[PDB]
From a paper:
Lactate dehydrogenase A ([name]) is a key enzyme in anaerobic respiration that is predominantly found in skeletal muscle and catalyses the reversible conversion of pyruvate to lactate in the presence of NADH. [name] is overexpressed in many tumours and has therefore emerged as an attractive target for anticancer drug discovery. Mechanistically, LDH follows an ordered sequential mechanism whereby NADH binding to the cofactor-binding site precedes binding of pyruvate to the substrate-binding site; this is followed by a conformational change in which the active-site loop (residues 96–111 in hLDH) closes over the active site to provide a largely desolvated ternary complex. In humans, lactate dehydrogenase (hLDH) occurs as homotetramers or heterotetramers predominantly comprising subunits encoded by the [name] (or [name], muscle) and LDH-B (or LDH-H, heart) genes that assemble to form hLDH-1 (B4), hLDH-2 (AB3), hLDH-3 (A2B2), hLDH-4 (A3B) and hLDH-5 (A4).
Numbering used by the authors:
A (entry chain A), B (entry chain H), C (entry chain H), D (entry chain A): 1 to 331
Write the structure that this text describes.
Amino acid sequence: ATLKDQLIYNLLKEEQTPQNKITVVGVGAVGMACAISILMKDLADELALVDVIEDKLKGEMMDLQHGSLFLRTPKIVSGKDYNVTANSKLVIITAGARQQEGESRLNLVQRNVNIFKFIIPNVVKYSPNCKLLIVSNPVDILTYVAWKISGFPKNRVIGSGCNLDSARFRYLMGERLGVHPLSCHGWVLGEHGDSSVPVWSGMNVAGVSLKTLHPDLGTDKDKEQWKEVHKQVVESAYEVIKLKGYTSWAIGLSVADLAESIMKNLRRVHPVSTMIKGLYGIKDDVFLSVPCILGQNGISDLVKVTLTSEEEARLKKSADTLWGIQKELQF
Amino acid sequence: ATLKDQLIYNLLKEEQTPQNKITVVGVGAVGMACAISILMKDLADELALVDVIEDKLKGEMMDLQHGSLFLRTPKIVSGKDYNVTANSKLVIITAGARQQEGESRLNLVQRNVNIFKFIIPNVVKYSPNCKLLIVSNPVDILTYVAWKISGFPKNRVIGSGCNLDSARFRYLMGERLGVHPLSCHGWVLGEHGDSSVPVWSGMNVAGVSLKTLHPDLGTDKDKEQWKEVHKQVVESAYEVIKLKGYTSWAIGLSVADLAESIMKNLRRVHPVSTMIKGLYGIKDDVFLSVPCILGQNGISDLVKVTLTSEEEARLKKSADTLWGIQKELQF
Amino acid sequence: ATLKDQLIYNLLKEEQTPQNKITVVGVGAVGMACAISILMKDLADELALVDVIEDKLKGEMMDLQHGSLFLRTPKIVSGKDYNVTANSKLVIITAGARQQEGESRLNLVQRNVNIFKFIIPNVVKYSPNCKLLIVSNPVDILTYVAWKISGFPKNRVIGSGCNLDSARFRYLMGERLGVHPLSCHGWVLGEHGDSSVPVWSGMNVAGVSLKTLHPDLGTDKDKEQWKEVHKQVVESAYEVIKLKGYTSWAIGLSVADLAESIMKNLRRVHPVSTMIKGLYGIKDDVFLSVPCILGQNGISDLVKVTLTSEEEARLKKSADTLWGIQKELQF
Amino acid sequence: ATLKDQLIYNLLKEEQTPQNKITVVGVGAVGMACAISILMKDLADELALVDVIEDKLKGEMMDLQHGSLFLRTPKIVSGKDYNVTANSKLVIITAGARQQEGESRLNLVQRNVNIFKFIIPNVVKYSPNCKLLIVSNPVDILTYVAWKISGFPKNRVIGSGCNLDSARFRYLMGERLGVHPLSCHGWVLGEHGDSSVPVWSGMNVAGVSLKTLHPDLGTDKDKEQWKEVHKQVVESAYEVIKLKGYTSWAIGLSVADLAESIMKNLRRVHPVSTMIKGLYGIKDDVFLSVPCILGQNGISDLVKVTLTSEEEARLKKSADTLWGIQKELQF
Ligand SMILES: NC(=O)C1=CN([C@@H]2O[C@H](COP(=O)(O)OP(=O)(O)OC[C@H]3O[C@@H](n4cnc5c(N)ncnc54)[C@H](O)[C@@H]3O)[C@@H](O)[C@H]2O)C=CC1
Ligand SMILES: NC(=O)C1=CN([C@@H]2O[C@H](COP(=O)(O)OP(=O)(O)OC[C@H]3O[C@@H](n4cnc5c(N)ncnc54)[C@H](O)[C@@H]3O)[C@@H](O)[C@H]2O)C=CC1
Ligand SMILES: NC(=O)C1=CN([C@@H]2O[C@H](COP(=O)(O)OP(=O)(O)OC[C@H]3O[C@@H](n4cnc5c(N)ncnc54)[C@H](O)[C@@H]3O)[C@@H](O)[C@H]2O)C=CC1
Ligand SMILES: NC(=O)C1=CN([C@@H]2O[C@H](COP(=O)(O)OP(=O)(O)OC[C@H]3O[C@@H](n4cnc5c(N)ncnc54)[C@H](O)[C@@H]3O)[C@@H](O)[C@H]2O)C=CC1
C-alpha cells in the first residue's frame, strides 16, 4: 500500500475536537496582528480565520501555515463559512468598515452594526459558549451591539477598550521617568479614544503616589504639563495613522495580552469595556472601560475605583453620549 | 525639583551600550514581519529599523513602541541615518526595489545592487563586526553582492536562501503524513526559488528513509507523485502572492529562527546561502543554500551532503547561471 | 549686532494686517489651478491655502513660495488650523470627497455636506465678512449648503455654477465662427452640468441675434445641429476627465475671473449660482446660475432674462430636483 | 447658405503663419506649469504641446482651450506628430524619465539621451531657427546633449540651469532680511542641484555688499550660518518633493521668466546653462550656469564674474565630473 501506511500504523480514527480554539474575524491589519501575536504566545491549539474577501483570507492562511515549523499551533484553518469556527473558546472580532471623511460617526456605526448583524449570529451558532472579545471601532458601542445581538451574559462580552490606551500611557510614563512600563503603573478608563479619563490619583512607581508627591499633577497649573501625557495617548494613534496608515502592532499585542488572561484563567486586572450600568453613576445600558478581572469565564469581577466628582462626570457624559447614539439603532 | 528627581535617585550617568542589538533594514511587509518575530522571541535588547521612507519608518517604530509593556525589548529605535544601527550583532537586509512594467530580471537586479551599494557600506561603517543576513530577492545574487561590497569574510555573510523553502517542504510532508513538520525531516538546497533541489535521499521520519521504503520517490514513475510536493513549494510563493499580494509571515518566522540560532550561539543546522566555491563541484564565487551550522560567528561549518550526479549537475547549472548574471554587474 | 540690524534700520514694529486677502480651501488639482491663476493675475496681497493632508499642503505652499521672485503677492501661507485664513475678503471652497465603488449621488453628497459642516463654520469664525465662492460638486447643492451653515446673506454666497459652462460654450461658438470667444456672446444658465439651459435667444456676435438669422437654431430641425454645441459643453467635462483624469486649468481660470470681478469691484455680469427663490418661477430655496452683477459685496444685482415656457420649465424641474435632494439632508 | 456665411463676410483666405509661437515638449507636471505660466504672461500667439501619451496630451490641450475666454493666446494646439510645432520661435523641453531608486545617475542620463535622440531631430526639422530651452534633468548634461544633436550654435541652446536655484536663494535671503526677493540680489552658479556655487562676494541689498559688512559670511566661523541658506536652496527641492511629490510651480515660473526675456528681446541677465568651454578655467565641452544676456537670439553675451580660487575650483570639478559622464555617451 501507500508510503504513509507503510511508514505509519494507525491506532486512532480520531475525533478532531479542539481543546483551546481561538477564532479571529477580519484579517485586516489588526486581525492579522492579533493572529501572529496569538500564534507566538502559544495561546491556541487551533486558530481559525474568517473574512468576506476570500483571496485575502486564503492567502493569509497559507502564509501562516507555511510558518508552521516555527510555531506550536498545530491547526490553522480559514473560511468564509462559520463552521470553521465551531467550538472556539474565544472569538475576536476585528471586522470593520473604514470611516470615510464625509461619513458621520453615526453612519459608520450603523454600517458596522449591519456587519455585526451578519457575524454575531453565525459565531454564536457554532460556538455558543465562547467569550466574545470586541476590537472593532467605535469599540464601546460595538461591544454593546455584540452583547445585544448575542444574548450572552455581560461576563462573556468584552471590549478591547482602554487596554491599549493604558499601555500607551504607561509607555509614555516610562519614557519620562527612565523606567520600564512594567514598573510604571497608571490607569486610563471610560470611553476608548478621545474621551478617555486618566486616573491621576493612582499614578505610581513602586506604590508611591505621584499625585501626593506632585499635587498639581494633571491640572493646568502643572508646571511639568502631565496632562500632555494623556493628550499624547490620544494623538499618538492619530500620528501613527498619519505616518504609516493605520495601527496594527500595538493593538495586536494588547489583544494577545487579554487572550492570555482568558485562555490561561489568570485573573489579572485589565481596563476593558464592560456593561457598566448601575455603577459610577451610570443608569443606561452602556459599555465603558473599568478594571476587570479576566479569566476562563471572561469578566468575573470589577474593581470599584474611587473617583473625583470631575472624573465621575466625564464618565457620565461619555455614557450619555454613547447612549444617545445607541438608542438610534435598529436590531 | 522635578517629579522625577523627587521620585528617583540616580547612581549612574550611563554609557548606553547595546549588548545584543539587531538591525532590520527595510520596513515593508517582510521587514516588519521579521521585526515582530524578533520582538516576540526576545532575541534583542535593542532593535533598530532603517528605511528611506521616513513616514512609514517612524510610524512603524511608534506602533511597536506602543506595545512595549507587552515586550521584553527595552529599546526600539528607527532612523534614516545609519548611526542608529551602531554596534549591531546582526543586521537583516530586507530592502529592495519593486519590478515594473517591462523590467528584465537584469534591470531589477541592477537597481537592487545599487541599493546595496548604498546600504552595505553604511552598515559596515557603524557595525563592523556584525553578521549580515540578506533576505531581498534575488537572494543568492544579492548575498553575493553584500559579501563583495562589505569585504566581510564568508562566515559573516549569510543569505536567507532555502530556509523558508525547506520549511514549506516540511509543512507539506507533514500534511501528507499526519505528523508535525518538526518531526518530518527533509532538505531543499541550492538556488532559492524555481531551481531548487529537494534531496529525497534524506527524507525521513524518525530516521526512516522514505527513499528506501519507496524507491520511486520523487521520480516520474512515482505513483504518489511526490515531485508535486516540491513543485508546490515553488508555486506556493506564487499562489500566496496572487491571493494576498505578497509574503510576510512565514519568511519573517524563518528569519527569526535563523536569528535565534545566531544570537544564542546554538549551532543548529539550517539550509542557508553561503559562498559555496570549493564545494559541490562549484568553481565560481556563487552563493547557494547548503546545510550550515549557525552560531555567534555566523556560518562556522558546513554539512557535506552526499548527492546523485543529477543533483550535483542541477547545482552546477544553477551556479553557472548565477555567475552568468553576476559577471554582468558593476561595482 | 546681526547682519540684518547692521544693514537695516527699523521704523515700524508692524501690525501685519492683510488688505486684499484670499483663501483657497482644498489643494487638489482644482484648488491649485485657482491658486496659480490668482497669483498670476495679482489679485491678492496674501494667499492662504488650507487642506487636511498636511504634506500636500506644505509642499504646494513651498513650491509657490519658491516662485516669489516672479510674483507680486508678498505673503503666501498654508495651514491646517483656520487661523491662517483670518480676514480674507474672499474664500474659495474646492474641498470635496471622491465618489467610490457603489456610492449613490446621495451618499457622496452627504459626505461632502459633512465636510462643509466642518469647513464653513471655521471659515466664518475667522473671516466673518468674506464672500464665499463655492466650487465643489455638486455645486448648486453645495452652495445652498454653505449658505445654510454660514448664515451669510444671499449676496455673499456665490457658486461657480455655469461660469465655466458658459466659457466652454463661447469657445465652441468661436470655433464654429472663426471669432474669439470674447466676441462671441452666449449664455448657459441654471443647473451646472447635464441639466443646463443654453439661452439661444441671446446668442449673438456684435449684437446680431443668431436666433433671428437662423430661426431653427438649437431645435431638432436645425440642419446645422447647434444643439450639439450645448451637448458638447456637457460632454466636454466628461471627455477631458476620461483623457487626462480630471479638470483643472479652465475651472481655475474661470474662478480667477470671478475673483477679479469681486476684488476689484468691477460689476461685471457673470452666470453664477445664486439663491434664486422669488425669481424665474422658482419657489424653493435652491441655487441656480443666472447673470449676476459681481463686485466688492458679492452679488449686488441680477439680470432678469426673458425665457420661453420650455426654458422656464427646465428651470422649474431642475429646481424641484435640487430641492428634492436638499430635503433629504441633515444639518 | 450657412449661418456663419450669413453672419460673416470673408476678405481673406488666410495663410495661417505663426508670429510668436512657443512649443512645450512633455506635458507632465513641469511642462504644464510652464504652459499655464506662458499663457498667463501672454508671451505667445500660438502654443503647441507635444507628448508620447496621447490621452494625457489631448486632455491637457482641451482643458486649456476651454479657458480661452480668459486668455489672450488665440491658438492652442497639440499632437504626437511634430508638424504641430512648425515655426516655433521657442521650444521648451520638459520630457523626461523618472529616476528610479536603484537607477544609476548614468542609466537615467542614457535613457533621457535616447529620448532626446528622438525629440531634437524632429523639433529641428520643423523649427530650424528656434531657440531651445532645456529643462529636463540632469539639465547641464541634457543641454549639452541637445546642442550636440541639434548642431545649433551655442547661443540658441539654453538650459534652465540655476535660474530657479537663484530664485530660491533670493527668496530665502528676503525671508531672513524682511525684504522682497526683487530687492535682495544674489547669484547661484555652476552645476544645477547639489554642486551649485553661491557667490557671496556679490550678495547685496541696494548695492551694499553683505560680504564686506559681515566678512565671515558663508564660511564656517559664520555665527549666523549663512551657508545654511545655500544648503536649504539644495534641500528645498528635496523637501518639496518629499512633501508633495514633485516640483512644478516654481520651475514653471522660472521658465516663463526666461521665455519673457527671449520672446520680448529684453537683454536681461539670467543664470542659465551655457557652453562654458574656454572660460572660468574649463577646457571641455561642458555646460554650466553663468550670468547670460537673454534676448531674441538666445544667449548673446556672458558676464565674466570674478571668483575666488575655491569657487573656480568647484566649477572645474563640476566640469570634470560632467565631462566624465558625457564622454561615455553614444550619438
Ligand atoms: N479598539 C482599538 O483599540 C482598535 C480598533 N481598531 C479597529 O479595527 C477595525 C479594523 O481595523 P483594520 O484591521 O486596520 O482594518 P482592515 O480594514 O484593513 O480590515 C477589516 C476587515 O474586516 C473585514 N469584513 C468586513 N465585513 C465583514 C463581514 N461581514 N464578515 C467578515 N469580515 C468582514 C474586511 O474584509 C477586512 O478584511 C476597525 O474597526 C478599526 O477601527 C483598530 C485599531 C485599534
Ligand atoms: N527569501 C525569501 O524567501 C523572501 C524574500 N523576499 C524579498 O524581500 C524583499 C522585501 O519584500 P517586501 O517587504 O514585500 O517589500 P516591501 O517592498 O513592501 O518594501 C521594501 C522596503 O525596502 C525599502 N528600501 C528600499 N531601498 C532602501 C534603501 N536604499 N535604504 C533603506 N530602505 C530601503 C522600501 O522603502 C520598502 O519599505 C523583496 O525584495 C522580496 O522579494 C520576499 C519574500 C520572501
Ligand atoms: N464647478 C466646476 O466647473 C468644477 C468643479 N469641480 C469640483 O471641485 C472639487 C475639487 O476637485 P479636485 O481638485 O480634482 O479634487 P481633489 O480631489 O484632487 O482633492 C480635493 C481636495 O479637497 C481636500 N479636502 C477634503 N476635505 C477637506 C477638509 N475637510 N478640509 C480641508 N481640505 C479638505 C482634499 O484633501 C483634496 O486635496 C470636486 O468636488 C470637483 O467635482 C471640479 C472641476 C470643475
Ligand atoms: N532643471 C530644473 O530646474 C527642473 C527640472 N525638472 C525635470 O523635468 C522633467 C519632467 O518633470 P515632470 O514634469 O515632473 O515629469 P512628468 O514625468 O510627470 O512627465 C514628463 C513627460 O515627458 C514625456 N515623454 C517621455 N518621452 C517622451 C518623448 N520621447 N517624446 C515626447 N514626450 C516624452 C512623458 O510622457 C511625460 O508626460 C524631469 O526631467 C525633471 O527632472 C523638474 C523640476 C525642475
